[PDB]
């Protein structure tokens, strides 16, 4: 780190080299077979059973996360290497071994052997530097919404006198396109959506909603979706559109869990997300206003 | 997920319950010992050796990451449970077993058994929702610096005519306090630092640097450190100040690696970080200007 000494360096090839050197030195020290086979076969059988136990939970998230082969290929990692090692173990090969092996796997799952080392958690979290979902949520909450949300219904009640007699719904409505393609103009997504007013006091937009003119909405896009899209159109990132969709979904759920527990943001903003494959933004927004 | 069906739900207690049920059903099926002991003792010995091999790499990051007992306690996790299991295995207990065990650990380290399942990577990354370091870096790069950095030396050469004859250094200098406490005024951190000018064209600040007046700096704080600090002063977060320091260091290194590979941002901005425990911002900045 050519900046400051207290800032740590990324993790290098330290464990592999010294580990191989020490564990080869012990081999040469003790240099000048069926227990080995049973041990490694039991190891791979336990790892495969652990993968099946993880797949038992990941069987639920099919339609919402993984859209079969891709699910198992993502949950067990590389099952080709595991199958090849299993065929080598069975070829170079006692049914009561399976009972104690299953009990060992049950004890390791329940008692929590699979709780990782915190150094491993750090090496996973600091890898690849594209884990962009929580910075956007906390920045969008602290930097924008926390400031604008206290005075919001006050300035709505300010505006309502000029439309009730001559109204505006009380909840702020945020659009969250999962395409991550955000135009500048909200009339450009639908001609039924027209600009009506700018709310006085920074930016706000009060809209009419359609010829059945029914809704008076306070509407706004979410901001960091454009940041995700510029990361997508940044060529040297190597940031795929599937990664964009993944981080968009995680951003949505994170912002939902933040607004679920906010003390001043309980019943004054509501999130609405959509995704195109026939479609209408206006019908979904009107469903939210009618259910309001 | 009460928002949209395609947004996935957090991972629940699915693996534990069904795994325990199935692995107890197999026990009751096969219901109506020293191999077990050797297998589990070999398991814990291999896990302990793997922890030592990880500690061999994590021995380097003492002064920069971990400031001994805390290092091992963070690298091996809970060694009390491992020691208790090791004493149970040795109590309820062949030196040539150690050679094959070490060779098994060497093969598992080198060939890459410890490459995790991608579902495990997802469950680690989606846990706890305080991994706030990359959203801030990419938002601060795309949203602010990418726009302001092309025209920067042009407007510096615009300004230089009024001070060379009557200068301004060419690199933008960013302060990065690791305290994450950012005052509004840069003269409030040091009376030697005085406001000289606002650079015409959004915000910019050209400063004199001290009675030995020597430096003409274009100076600015980094923005999301205030976001980190407001996360620190948010009471319901449970966000400790050590977590704040950790995410600040990771933010610094991430922004450094982004600016290392930027195509238009090669030699026009330089990062400077500092940390208080006698101190001077001005002396460190002047060292950077003299080495310039």
TrEMBL record, chains A, B:
STING transmembrane domain span: 34-129
The STING ligand-binding domain sits at 131-292
UniProt keyword Membrane present: yes
Q: Which GO terms describe its molecular function?
A: 2',3'-cyclic GMP-AMP binding
The record describes its membrane topology as:
Multi-pass membrane protein
Task: Give Gene Ontology CC terms.
Answer: autophagosome membrane; endoplasmic reticulum membrane; endoplasmic reticulum-Golgi intermediate compartment membrane; Golgi membrane; mitochondrial outer membrane; perinuclear region of cytoplasm
What does the entry give for GO biological process? Answer: activation of innate immune response; positive regulation of type I interferon production
State where the protein is found. Cytoplasm, Perinuclear region; Cytoplasmic vesicle, Autophagosome membrane; Endoplasmic reticulum membrane; Endoplasmic reticulum-Golgi intermediate compartment membrane
Q: Which domain of life is it from?
A: Eukaryota
Catalysed reactions, as listed in the record: H(+)(in) = H(+)(out)
The answer to whether keyword Endoplasmic reticulum applies is: yes
Its keywords, alphabetically, are: Endoplasmic reticulum, Membrane, Mitochondrion, Mitochondrion outer membrane, Nucleotide-binding, Transmembrane, Transmembrane helix
Q: Which family does it belong to?
A: Belongs to the STING family.
Recorded protein name is Stimulator of interferon genes protein
The gene from which this protein is expressed is STING
């Amino acid at each position: 780190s050519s900046l400051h000494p207290s800032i740590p360096c990324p993790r290098g090839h330290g464990a592999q080299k010294a580990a191989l050197v020490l564990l080869s030195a012990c081999l040469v020290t003790l240099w000048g077979l069926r227990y080995l086979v049973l041990h490694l076969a039991s190891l791979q059988l336990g790892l495969l059973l652990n993968g099946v136990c993880s797949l038992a939970e990941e069987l639920r998230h099919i339609h919402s996360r993984y859209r079969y082969w891709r699910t198992v290929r993502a949950c067990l990692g590389c099952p080709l290497r595991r199958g090849a090692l299993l065929l080598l173990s069975i070829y170079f090969y006692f049914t009561w071994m399976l009972a104690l092996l299953g009990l060992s796997q049950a004890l390791n799952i329940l008692l929590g052997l699979k709780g990782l080392a915190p150094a491993e958690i750090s090496a996973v979290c600091e890898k690849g530097n594209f884990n962009v979902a929580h910075g956007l949520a906390w920045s969008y909450y602290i930097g924008y919404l926390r400031l604008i949300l206290p005075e919001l219904q006050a300035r709505i009640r300010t505006y309502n006198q000029h439309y009730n007699n001559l109204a505006v719904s009380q909840r702020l409505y945020i659009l969250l396109p999962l395409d991550c393609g955000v135009p500048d103009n909200l009339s450009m997504a639908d001609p039924n959506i027209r600009f009506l007013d700018k709310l006085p006091q920074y930016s706000n937009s009060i809209y009419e909603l359609l010829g059945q003119r029914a809704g008076t909405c306070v509407l706004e896009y979410a901001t960091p979706l454009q940041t995700l899209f510029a990361m997508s159109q940044y060529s040297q990132a190597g940031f795929s559109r599937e990664d964009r969709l993944e981080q968009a979904k995680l951003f949505c759920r994170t912002l939902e869990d933040i607004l679920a527990d906010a003390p001043e943001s309980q019943n004054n903003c509501r999130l609405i997300a959509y995704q195109e494959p026939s479609f209408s933004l206006s019908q979904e927004v009107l469903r939210h206003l009618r259910q309001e």
